[PDB]
Amino acid sequence: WARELGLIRKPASFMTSICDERGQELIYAGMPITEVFKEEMGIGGVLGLLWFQKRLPKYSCQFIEMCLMVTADHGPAVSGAHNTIICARAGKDLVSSLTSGLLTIGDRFGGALDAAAKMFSKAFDSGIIPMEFVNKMKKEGKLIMGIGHRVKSINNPDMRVQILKDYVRQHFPATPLLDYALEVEKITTSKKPNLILNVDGLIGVAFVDMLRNCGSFTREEADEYIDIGALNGIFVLGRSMGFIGHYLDQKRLKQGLYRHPWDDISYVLPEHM
Amino acid sequence: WARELGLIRKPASFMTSICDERGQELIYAGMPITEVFKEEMGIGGVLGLLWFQKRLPKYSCQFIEMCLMVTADHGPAVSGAHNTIICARAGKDLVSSLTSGLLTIGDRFGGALDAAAKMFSKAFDSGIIPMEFVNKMKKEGKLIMGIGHRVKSINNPDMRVQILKDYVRQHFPATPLLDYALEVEKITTSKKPNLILNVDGLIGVAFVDMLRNCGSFTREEADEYIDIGALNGIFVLGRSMGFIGHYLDQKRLKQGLYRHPWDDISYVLPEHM
Amino acid sequence: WARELGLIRKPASFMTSICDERGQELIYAGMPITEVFKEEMGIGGVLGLLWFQKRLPKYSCQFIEMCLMVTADHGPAVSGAHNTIICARAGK
Amino acid sequence: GKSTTLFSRHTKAIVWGMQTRAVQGMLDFDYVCSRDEPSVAAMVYPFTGDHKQKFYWGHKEILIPVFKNMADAMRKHPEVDVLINFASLRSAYDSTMETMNYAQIRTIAIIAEGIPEALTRKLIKKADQKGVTIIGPATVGGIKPGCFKIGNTGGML
């Protein structure tokens, strides 16, 4: 009561500059809810607002919608989806068995997006020629992330990295990075019959070429939002929709508990202690 | 080597009827990757395939895309998003601070979708008249889930529950539940000036009216997929994009560690032990 | 400063009847920290206090210490320990 | 070489030491006298970074910068003429001798308690030839009502 007629003070934590919820209409980063469907933008449109707080124009709204559409689930072998089958067979629920699976996105699986942007955004803005970038790395180890594929590289393309290749070719002026990305490819495709840009490699540069080529992002929200790790945000929003699809399949078929039998273990206990 | 020329056997675990990934093109539940963009369906289209394994027709593909577009963030006060600010201020990373955030969707927050479908799907298919359904509950306690709103109910709608109301009115023949949903509303709106169908309540019935009205789902995949909890899958895919939207906001402003000061605690330690 | 000389009010959430931490010594459910080692109870002794808030007598303090000592790990086959090897190999 | 009118309605001052309550205790005195601008320009504390500290001028939020070195207090804002120190006895002397080298400051007052009498008499030679009035140690402070107030003189409002 005493604060309502305004006589005391209070300091305020919890900055949270998104999604005004009290009042009569939920305002997003610049817009009420009903005004969104009058422009009728897709959920890429709210993916601009809730993440970047700029009205992103609808030639690229369909790009980031197309971007997570191709980074869906990738089969049950991968160590991301392999956990969330196990926590499905133990039969917990959905959301405590979705959250076991997003725990593996780290520095040796699935975070190859973040390495295939910060290896190229450094080596272009403070950059050097293509045939010394490759020369610098191949005197140190440290292979180029986003590049490497076991099955189909040359004269036999990936058939989905080329789906994005024309959609970034039409509605995207001013692409410095991706034309710098292809020129690191051409030297390396002569070097090995493998080593095309992977689908994680192109999105490592097709997303940063979405920022500094579109308007309303100058040079300071373009680099910091890759620095915080919003590029991981495209991934763990993307692979999250497949894990549940992995999960719902693992509960419809009504499987029992998994055990992982003893004939792979080979215990290496010492002599006596 | 010896299994390759096929002489031994092996039993097989891991049933996983989704996402064929070895071969040359990633086949989804019925379709290769490139054939998806030739029909050019949205990510609602892959949301049909990766969850329900049926080619969902593209009048309802835009419904489930619109369905998670309105179940974005609902404000930074709610106990879902309140955790993921705290693990943002402690500064872990993105995907461990999305991980603590989805762990709160349970039986007292945000799972009201699951109660606002299985209270109505029971009381319609094995159903009774509207003015004994309300009479049955109001001799037991157990208030109707999906209904209850503190601010704007009558002569003043919430302006987004009506947004879905026409989009389910045009492209949706055969709606038994939602017309049965509105008739539970009309008796109750006369009973109290509050108690409109909430946005979580309509989606609790607009989604089950998506299943048993559209084709390719007869009555046996329509009920079991609400029984497993795939309707929670709409929610924790939906609220997962607002959580990161809090997180990128809570790291750009570069805040320090939170402490929650002592003047709310009021320790109730006993006398001596 | 206004609440320090006590003129306004405030309702209080967060009941938490364990582990007084402000002051000079951390009091547990009935006892300061230093008084625990003067009786010298094991961590079963704090397992009585922090969970059940009763001074549990030290014939059974050694039971619940023995109780979790035999329910340790049970080999890497079981689906509990099988996950945490996988998220170890991914190196988080 | 001193001034005559020490304080006015256009006086600005910079405090030393993280003593934000007394900074708040100074800022509200500007509000009740309805002075046009706030008086506290910067807070000089070398053990933090360079950022902006939040306070409450009336009901709104105001952002006062915290600086790390004394020369960067001079660069963007050389119109400050009164410098204050609220540090303890263990660092009072070094915060003063480097200060009076910058001659744009015209008034210095010291609050700290426990200063040696030689360090008391070390300071007086330097301001004698330069002309800065010293209202130094074991002092609660001074008041010019309607215009300006030093320290927790008067206490709360």
Short mmCIF file of C-alpha atoms in Angstrom, two decimals, chain B residues 158-271:
data_model
loop_
_atom_site.label_atom_id
_atom_site.label_comp_id
_atom_site.label_asym_id
_atom_site.label_seq_id
_atom_site.Cartn_x
_atom_site.Cartn_y
_atom_site.Cartn_z
CA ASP B 158 -7.11 -10.96 -24.06
CA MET B 159 -6.75 -10.11 -27.81
CA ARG B 160 -4.75 -13.27 -28.62
CA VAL B 161 -7.19 -15.98 -27.57
CA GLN B 162 -9.43 -14.41 -30.22
CA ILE B 163 -6.54 -14.37 -32.70
CA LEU B 164 -6.64 -18.15 -32.87
CA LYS B 165 -10.45 -18.08 -32.72
CA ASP B 166 -10.97 -17.08 -36.34
CA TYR B 167 -8.06 -19.14 -37.69
CA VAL B 168 -9.72 -22.20 -36.24
CA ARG B 169 -13.01 -20.93 -37.67
CA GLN B 170 -11.97 -20.78 -41.31
CA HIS B 171 -9.78 -23.70 -42.25
CA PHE B 172 -11.14 -26.34 -39.86
CA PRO B 173 -14.21 -28.43 -40.62
CA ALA B 174 -15.63 -30.87 -38.06
CA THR B 175 -14.94 -29.21 -34.73
CA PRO B 176 -16.85 -31.09 -32.00
CA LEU B 177 -14.60 -30.18 -29.09
CA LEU B 178 -14.21 -26.44 -29.58
CA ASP B 179 -17.92 -25.87 -30.02
CA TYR B 180 -18.26 -28.02 -26.90
CA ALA B 181 -15.53 -25.84 -25.39
CA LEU B 182 -17.38 -22.57 -26.01
CA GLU B 183 -20.56 -23.98 -24.48
CA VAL B 184 -18.72 -24.63 -21.23
CA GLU B 185 -17.61 -21.00 -21.47
CA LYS B 186 -21.09 -19.44 -21.87
CA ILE B 187 -22.52 -21.04 -18.73
CA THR B 188 -19.44 -20.00 -16.76
CA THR B 189 -19.19 -16.44 -18.08
CA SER B 190 -22.67 -15.93 -16.67
CA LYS B 191 -21.42 -17.51 -13.43
CA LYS B 192 -18.41 -15.21 -12.96
CA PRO B 193 -17.08 -12.04 -14.62
CA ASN B 194 -13.77 -13.89 -14.97
CA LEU B 195 -13.33 -17.46 -16.32
CA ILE B 196 -12.90 -17.13 -20.04
CA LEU B 197 -10.95 -19.87 -21.84
CA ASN B 198 -7.29 -19.05 -21.41
CA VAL B 199 -4.74 -19.15 -24.21
CA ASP B 200 -3.48 -22.38 -22.69
CA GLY B 201 -7.03 -23.70 -22.53
CA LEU B 202 -7.85 -23.11 -26.20
CA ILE B 203 -4.63 -24.76 -27.36
CA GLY B 204 -5.57 -27.64 -25.07
CA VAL B 205 -8.57 -28.12 -27.37
CA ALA B 206 -7.50 -26.47 -30.64
CA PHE B 207 -4.72 -29.02 -30.94
CA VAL B 208 -6.89 -32.08 -30.33
CA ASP B 209 -9.34 -30.56 -32.80
CA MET B 210 -6.42 -30.48 -35.21
CA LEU B 211 -5.95 -34.23 -34.93
CA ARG B 212 -9.36 -35.89 -35.18
CA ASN B 213 -10.66 -33.42 -37.78
CA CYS B 214 -7.77 -33.55 -40.23
CA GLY B 215 -7.11 -36.66 -42.29
CA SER B 216 -4.49 -39.41 -41.87
CA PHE B 217 -5.22 -39.80 -38.14
CA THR B 218 -8.16 -42.03 -37.46
CA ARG B 219 -8.94 -42.28 -33.76
CA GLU B 220 -6.02 -44.36 -32.49
CA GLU B 221 -3.10 -42.05 -33.17
CA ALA B 222 -5.27 -39.10 -32.16
CA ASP B 223 -5.76 -40.22 -28.57
CA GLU B 224 -2.48 -41.97 -27.80
CA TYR B 225 -0.41 -38.99 -28.91
CA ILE B 226 -2.20 -36.89 -26.36
CA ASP B 227 -1.73 -39.76 -23.89
CA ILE B 228 2.07 -39.92 -24.31
CA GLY B 229 2.36 -36.19 -23.87
CA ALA B 230 3.21 -34.82 -27.30
CA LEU B 231 1.05 -31.83 -26.43
CA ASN B 232 3.68 -30.93 -23.83
CA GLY B 233 6.00 -31.01 -26.83
CA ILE B 234 4.29 -27.94 -28.24
CA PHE B 235 4.88 -26.11 -24.99
CA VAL B 236 8.51 -26.89 -24.24
CA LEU B 237 9.38 -26.25 -27.82
CA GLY B 238 7.52 -22.98 -27.52
CA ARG B 239 8.78 -21.62 -24.22
CA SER B 240 12.29 -22.75 -25.16
CA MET B 241 12.70 -19.87 -27.60
CA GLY B 242 11.68 -17.23 -25.08
CA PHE B 243 14.08 -18.61 -22.48
CA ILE B 244 17.09 -18.08 -24.70
CA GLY B 245 15.59 -14.70 -25.51
CA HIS B 246 15.82 -13.94 -21.83
CA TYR B 247 19.31 -15.39 -21.73
CA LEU B 248 20.74 -13.33 -24.58
CA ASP B 249 19.14 -10.30 -22.96
CA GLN B 250 20.60 -11.25 -19.57
CA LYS B 251 24.11 -11.50 -20.97
CA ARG B 252 24.19 -8.45 -23.24
CA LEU B 253 23.48 -6.10 -20.34
CA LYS B 254 26.43 -7.71 -18.47
CA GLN B 255 24.91 -8.18 -15.05
CA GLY B 256 26.56 -9.44 -11.88
CA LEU B 257 25.73 -12.27 -9.53
CA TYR B 258 22.34 -12.25 -7.78
CA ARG B 259 22.01 -12.74 -4.03
CA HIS B 260 18.28 -12.50 -2.96
CA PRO B 261 18.73 -10.47 0.25
CA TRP B 262 17.95 -11.66 3.74
CA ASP B 263 14.89 -9.51 4.40
CA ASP B 264 12.34 -11.97 3.11
CA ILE B 265 13.65 -15.15 4.71
CA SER B 266 12.44 -15.30 8.36
CA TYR B 267 14.28 -18.40 9.58
CA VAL B 268 12.14 -20.80 11.63
CA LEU B 269 14.91 -22.82 13.27
CA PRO B 270 13.70 -24.55 16.47
CA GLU B 271 14.96 -23.84 19.98
#
